[PDB]
């Protein structure tokens, strides 16, 4: 059983996610159009940048995040943004066609499309496999948003100052998640452990992405196609 | 009469311009789509950035520019890019509808459209009036490209080191232009002086644009919609 405290935490996260994830993907038509070597880079740079703004919006609504210092907020986001984007994208991912279907055909992305922005199958193969395994967990929306919040509030991310406050926030979220599964998730005996392992898979995806980002951003002809927000967030600058 | 030296200068400029100005505007569909408050900013930021890359390409083909130091090349471009873009745009400007018609309807820009990127009529009124007066000069393609080259090779632009070399290059271009008009331009007695005054009008447009750019770029919600190349070139950093 949960307290009205743990309950309002879940309610806050679900509402935060609904305010930051447009199920109609109506803003996608504002992005540089997709073109199916680097033909998809302009469109995907815009898509990723738009997603970063949405992840920041989601984070600002996570209970306790707003009270952290501007420095820790930046620290948590620069480290976790790519992971949250990968996590939140499971909502459009389809096991049927192994693609991220974001509304119309123009915005249905397969492994073929996402390999046209400079990144290799070395990143994309594990990413698609991650989506598949995650989609098979059949997470309730409640567990989905809790997992993103837990991923974001990891005190072991570089640059973090108030470890105690952040660890306290994450431990509370994990407690809420274990209680939610036990009570609301039929046959979810091993789900929490499977969800924690996904966090470990995200660290590995973060590393491979960070590696490829570094290599690519070193070429100005490539980095010039990115947005100022992507350059800030995925960049290596430190507060 | 011109020498095969002055002649090849004109030939070099015309060819440079043909290699950097696509009369079909076929790349415009790759830009963030236009949307007719700041609704046109994403599309126009892309359009301006694409134009800057094309102006750099044009400059690299101007005889003598390539031999300047990387520092002077950067100096001349940061100072003149906005002017060359305004000058080169006269090619799509139509006195009939007072618009820049770049191919299809999606890319026909009127005063209404270009006022939706943050810039005010304080910049746009003089800009449209400049286009009108310039279009009425009925410049031959040869005079058009010479004027852009002369505008770019002004030794009195901030940060310029080799003034003598640059002044020598510009004086030679002006000589070629005066000779071309006298010989090839029927009734062009006062044209050269009218063309030189346009250079002065461009300095004034540069100033107003620089002023507005500074004000707008100070707001991150606005600057984040720009491209890395626009931020570099229109920014205030110095070599």
């Amino acid at each position: 059983m949960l307290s009205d405290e743990q309950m309002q935490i879940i309610n806050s996260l679900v509402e935060a996610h609904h305010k930051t994830y447009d199920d109609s993907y109506s803003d996608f038509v504002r992005f540089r159009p997709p073109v199916r070597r680097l033909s998809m880079l302009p469109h995907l740079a815009d898509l990723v940048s738009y997603s970063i703004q949405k992840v920041i919006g989601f984070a600002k609504m996570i209970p306790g995040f707003r009270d952290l210092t501007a420095e820790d907020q930046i620290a948590l986001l620069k480290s976790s943004a790519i992971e949250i984007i990968m996590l939140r994208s499971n909502q459009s991912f389809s096991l049927e066609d192994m693609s991220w279907s974001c509304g119309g055909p123009d915005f249905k992305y397969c492994i073929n499309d996402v390999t046209k922005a400079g990144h290799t199958l070395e990143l994309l193969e594990p990413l698609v496999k991650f989506q598949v395994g995650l989609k098979k967990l059949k997470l309730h929306e409640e567990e989905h948003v809790l997992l993103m919040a837990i991923c974001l509030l990891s005190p072991d991310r570089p640059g973090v100052q108030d470890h105690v406050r952040i660890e306290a926030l994450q431990d509370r979220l994990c407690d809420v998640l274990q209680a939610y599964i036990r009570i609301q998730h039929p046959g979810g005996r091993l789900l929490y452990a499977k969800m924690i392992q996904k966090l470990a898979d995200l660290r590995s995806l973060n590393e491979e992405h960070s590696k490829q980002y570094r290599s690519l951003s070193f070429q100005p002809e490539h980095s010039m196609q990115l947005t100022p927000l992507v350059l800030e967030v995925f960049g290596s600058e430190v507060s | 009469m011109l020498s095969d030296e002055q002649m090849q200068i004109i030939n070099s400029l015309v060819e440079a311009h043909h290699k950097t100005y696509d009369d079909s505007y076929s790349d415009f569909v790759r830009f963030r789509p236009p949307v007719r408050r700041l609704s046109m900013l994403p599309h126009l930021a892309d359009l301006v950035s694409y134009s800057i890359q094309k102006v750099i390409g044009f400059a690299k083909m101007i005889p003598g520019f390539r031999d300047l130091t990387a520092e002077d090349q950067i100096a001349l471009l940061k100072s003149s890019a906005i002017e060359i873009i305004m000058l080169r745009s006269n090619q799509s400007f139509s006195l009939e509808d007072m618009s820049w018609s770049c191919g299809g309807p999606d890319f026909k820009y009127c005063i209404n459209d270009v006022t939706k990127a943050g810039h005010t009529l304080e910049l746009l009124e003089p800009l449209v009036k400049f286009q009108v007066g310039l279009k009425k000069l009925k410049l031959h393609e040869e005079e058009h490209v010479l004027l852009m080259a002369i505008c770019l090779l002004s030794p009195d632009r901030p940060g310029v080191q080799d003034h003598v070399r640059i002044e020598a290059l510009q004086d030679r271009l002006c000589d070629v232009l005066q000779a071309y008009i006298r010989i090839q331009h029927p009734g062009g007695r006062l044209l050269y002086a009218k063309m030189i005054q346009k250079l002065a009008d461009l300095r004034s447009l540069n100033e107003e644009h620089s002023k507005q750019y500074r004000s707008l770029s100070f707001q991150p919600e606005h600057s984040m919609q720009l491209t890395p190349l626009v931020l570099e070139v229109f920014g205030s950093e110095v070599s």
Binding site: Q53, I56, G57, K60, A70, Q73, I74, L77, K78, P228, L229, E232, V233, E237, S239 | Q219, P220, E221, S223, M224
Partner: peptide, 10 residues
Amino acid sequence: GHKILHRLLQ
């Protein structure tokens, strides 16, 4: 730096 980040974080 982090000009955009600071701003978006309100």
